[PDB]
Amino acid sequence: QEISYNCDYGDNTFNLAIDIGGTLAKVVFSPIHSNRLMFYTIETEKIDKFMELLHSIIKEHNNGCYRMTHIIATGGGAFKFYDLLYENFPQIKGISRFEEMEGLIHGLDFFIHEIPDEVFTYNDQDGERIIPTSSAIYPYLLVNIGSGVSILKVTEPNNFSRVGGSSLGGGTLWGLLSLITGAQTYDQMLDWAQEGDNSSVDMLVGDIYGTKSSAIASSFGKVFQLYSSHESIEKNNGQMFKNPDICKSLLFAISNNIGQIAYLQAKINNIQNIYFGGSYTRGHLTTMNTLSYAINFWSQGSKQAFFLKHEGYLGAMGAFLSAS
Amino acid sequence: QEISYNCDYGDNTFNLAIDIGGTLAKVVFSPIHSNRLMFYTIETEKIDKFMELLHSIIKEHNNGCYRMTHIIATGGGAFKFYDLLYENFPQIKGISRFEEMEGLIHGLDFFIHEIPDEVFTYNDQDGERIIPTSSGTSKAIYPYLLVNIGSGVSILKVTEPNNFSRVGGSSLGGGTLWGLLSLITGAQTYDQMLDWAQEGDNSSVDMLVGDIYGTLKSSAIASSFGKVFQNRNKLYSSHESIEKNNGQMFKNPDICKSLLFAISNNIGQIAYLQAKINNIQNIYFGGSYTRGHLTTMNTLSYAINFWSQGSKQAFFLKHEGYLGAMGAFLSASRHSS
Ligand SMILES: [Mg+2]
Numbered sequence: 188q189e190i191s192y193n194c195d196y197g198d199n200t201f202n203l204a205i206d207i208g209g210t211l212a213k214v215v216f217s218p219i220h221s222n223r224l225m226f227y228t229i230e231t232e233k234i235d236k237f238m239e240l241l242h243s244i245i246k247e248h249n250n251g252c253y254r255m256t257h258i259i260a261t262g263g264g265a266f267k268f269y270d271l272l273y274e275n276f277p278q279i280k281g282i283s284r285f286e287e288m289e290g291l292i293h294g295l296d297f298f299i300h301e302i303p304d305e306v307f308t309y310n311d312q313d314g315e316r317i318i319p320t321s322s323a324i325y326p327y328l329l330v331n332i333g334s335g336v337s338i339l340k341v342t343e344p345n346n347f348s349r350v351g352g353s354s355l356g357g358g359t360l361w362g363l364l365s366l367i368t369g370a371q372t373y374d375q376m377l378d379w380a381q382e383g384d385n386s387s388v389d390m391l392v393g394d395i396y397g398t399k400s401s402a403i404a405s406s407f408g409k410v411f412q413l414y415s416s417h418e419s420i421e422k423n424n425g426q427m428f429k430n431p432d433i434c435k436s437l438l439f440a441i442s443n444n445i446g447q448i449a450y451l452q453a454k455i456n457n458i459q460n461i462y463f464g465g466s467y468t469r470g471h472l473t474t475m476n477t478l479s480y481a482i483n484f485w486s487q488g489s490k491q492a493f494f495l496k497h498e499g500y501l502g503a504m505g506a507f508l509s510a511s
Numbered sequence: 512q513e514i515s516y517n518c519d520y521g522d523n524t525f526n527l528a529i530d531i532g533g534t535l536a537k538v539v540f541s542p543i544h545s546n547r548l549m550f551y552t553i554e555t556e557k558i559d560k561f562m563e564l565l566h567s568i569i570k571e572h573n574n575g576c577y578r579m580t581h582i583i584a585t586g587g588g589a590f591k592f593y594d595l596l597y598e599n600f601p602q603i604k605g606i607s608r609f610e611e612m613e614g615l616i617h618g619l620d621f622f623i624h625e626i627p628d629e630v631f632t633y634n635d636q637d638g639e640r641i642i643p644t645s646s647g648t649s650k651a652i653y654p655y656l657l658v659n660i661g662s663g664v665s666i667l668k669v670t671e672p673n674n675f676s677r678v679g680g681s682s683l684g685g686g687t688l689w690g691l692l693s694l695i696t697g698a699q700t701y702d703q704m705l706d707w708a709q710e711g712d713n714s715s716v717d718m719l720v721g722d723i724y725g726t727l728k729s730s731a732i733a734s735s736f737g738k739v740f741q742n743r744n745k746l747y748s749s750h751e752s753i754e755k756n757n758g759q760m761f762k763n764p765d766i767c768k769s770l771l772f773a774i775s776n777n778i779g780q781i782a783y784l785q786a787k788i789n790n791i792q793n794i795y796f797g798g799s800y801t802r803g804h805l806t807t808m809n810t811l812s813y814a815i816n817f818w819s820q821g822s823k824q825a826f827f828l829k830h831e832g833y834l835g836a837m838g839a840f841l842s843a844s845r846h847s848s
Contacts, residue, residue, distance in 0.1 A: 210734075440687065
C-alpha cells in the first residue's frame with residue numbers, strides 16, 4: 188500500500204514509524220525525497236521477526252543507512268519496547284516515542300483532512316460511498332479496534348480524550364474462532380462468516396417466542412442446549428456445529444457489541460460521527476455492514492459509522508507526522 | 512427457598528405462576544391458607560419432566576384439585592408453550608399470560624418493598640450486606656435499572672411506581688457464556704463451569720494491560736482471549752475436535768475464568784452506560800446468571816463501581832430468578848381476590 192504525498196524531508200532523514208500493538212505491528216515510512224507514504228503490517232508473534240522486518244525496510248528502502256534513519260515508536264507498546272529498539276538498532280540516528288492516543292488522532296485527522304478517497308461509508312444496500320472530507324467533521328468518536336477496543340472523543344483538532352473501551356475486541360473474535368474452528372487465518376474466518384447462518388447456534392427472537400424475527404436474542408444461545416455406573420457422557424460431547432455458522436455468530440456477537448458500546452458512548456457525549464479504526468474490518472463487507480447497521484439501528488439513522496481505507500495505520504501515521 | 516407472607520387467598524383459586532425463558536422455567540405458588548411463597552426452577556428441555564413438576568405441585572400442594580388451579584404464564588416462552596400447557600392441563604380452571612416486562616417489575620418491586628433480607632450488595636472487600644429496602648424509610652429506591660440476565664440480557668428502567676420501560680439490552684448473556692464454555696471446555700453443568708472459573712487464571716489466555724503497556728491497573732484485562740490467536744474444508748466442529756486440537760495448550764479453568772470475566776465485565780459496562788444515560792444510580796441484577804456466585808457478583812459490582820467512580824451501585828436479589836414469576840403470581844392473586 189502506498190499514498191502519494193509531498194512530504195517534508197528538511198531533516199534529510201528516513202522516518203520509520205512503528206505502531207506496536209498487542210498482536211500486530213504497523214509501520215509507516217517514506218523513502219527520502221520519494222513523496223510516497225508506504226504502509227506495512229506484520230504479525231509480531233515472535234519479537235525477533237518484527238525487528239527483522241525493520242532491518243529489511245532500512246536495507247531495502249534507505250540503502251541500509253541506519254545513521255540516517257529515525258524510528259518513532261507508538262501504539263500501546265511504544266514506551267515498553269523503547270529500550271529493546273535501541274538494543275536492536277545501535278547505529279540508528281535516533282529513536283523517539285509518540286503516545287498511543289495522540290498518535291491515533293493525529294493520524295486520523297491527517298487522513299480526514301489531507302488524503303482523498305480515504306473516508307467512506309458502507310452498507311449492503313447503498314454500497315461504498317466515499318466521503319469528501321478532504322474537500323461538519325467535529326465532534327467525532329474514534330473506535331479503535333484491535334487488542335481490545337479503545338474509544339476516543341475528539342471535539343476539535345488537537346483536543347481529545349479517552350472514554351471507556353472494551354476488552355471484547357478483535358483479539359477476542361480471532362481467539363475464539365481460532366480455538367473453536369481451527370481456522371488459521373483471518374481470511375478463512377471471514378470467508379466462513381460470509382457464508383454461514385448464525386441461526387443454527389444463536390437464539391433468535393423467533394426461537395424464544397415461537398413462530399424483527401431475525402433479531403438475535405442470545406448469541407451462541409443454542410449451543411449449551413460418585414463414580415461411573417451408567418453410559419458415558421459422550422452424547423453431548425459429540426454434538427457438532429457448523430464452522431461457517433459459528434464464524435457468522437461470533438462475528439455478529441463481537442461487532443454488534445462494539446457497535447452498541449460505540450453508540451452508547453456517542454449518545455452520552457452528544458456525538459453523531461463514529462469512525463472505526465484498527466485492523467478489525469479489513470475492508471470486509473459483512474463486518475462493515477454489521478458495524479454500520481448497529482449504529483444505524485440504535486440511532487434510527489441519526490448517527491453515522493465511517494470507515495477508513497488505512498484504518499490500521501492511524502497511530503503509525505500520527506507518529507510519522509510527529510517526526511517532521 | 513420459601514418466604515412467609517400473609518396472602519389474601521380470595522376465592523381459594525390456587526395460582527401457579529410460571530416464567531418460561533429460553534432454557535429455564537421458574538415457578539411460584541402458595542398453598543391455600545399457608546401464607547408461604549414457594550419457588551422451584553426446572554429446565555424446559557425435557558418437556559415431560561417440566562410438566563411432571565407442575566402436576567406434582569398441584570397433587571402435593573393443592574390436594575390434586577386441578578379444577579381450582581389457575582396457571583399464569585409469563586416470559587418469552589409463555590407464547591411458545593401455551594398449547595403445551597393447554598394439552599397437559601385439560602381439567603384446569605384457566606390458563607392466562609402475563610406480559611414479560613410488567614411481570615419482572617411487579618415482581619421486583621414486591622421483593623424490594625415487602626420481603627426482608629432479599630436485596631443485598633456484595634464485593635470481595637465488604638462481603639455481603641443486606642439492604643433494608645422493605646423496612647420503613649422512595650427517593651432511595653427509585654429510579655433504578657433492572658438488568659435481567661438469562662439467555663440474553665434485558666434492561667428495564669423504572670423511574671417511579673408503575674413507570675417503567677425497556678432500554679437497549681444485549682445478546683451476550685448467560686446463553687453466550689454457557690454455549691461457549693460447554694463447547695470449548697466440555698463442562699457438563701453451569702455449576703461446573705463456575706467452579707472451574709473459580710480455580711482458573713485468566714492471565715494465560717487474556718492480554719492484560721501490563722502485557723501491552725508494561726508498568727487502568729496493570730492487572731486489568733485489555734483483550735479477552737487475546738493470547739489465544741497469538742499462541743495458536745471441515746464443515747463441523749465439536750468439543751472433541753476442539754479438545755483434540757488444543758491439547759492442553761490452554762487450560763479449561765483459565766478459559767472459564769476469562770470468559771466469565773469477559774461476559775460479566777461487558778454486562779456491567781452496558782448496565783453502567785445505560786444508567787449513565789438515564790441518570791440512575793441503583794442497578795439491580797435479576798435472572799439466573801449470578802446464582803449467588805461470589806466471583807460473578809464481585810465482577811459485576813466492581814465494573815459498576817469502576818466506571819461510575821463509586822457513584823453507582825450493583826444490587827443482587829436472593830430470589831433473582833423469580834422476579835417475573837412473582838409478578839405474574841401477584842396479578843393472578845389480585846384476580847382471585
Ligand atoms: Mg522520545
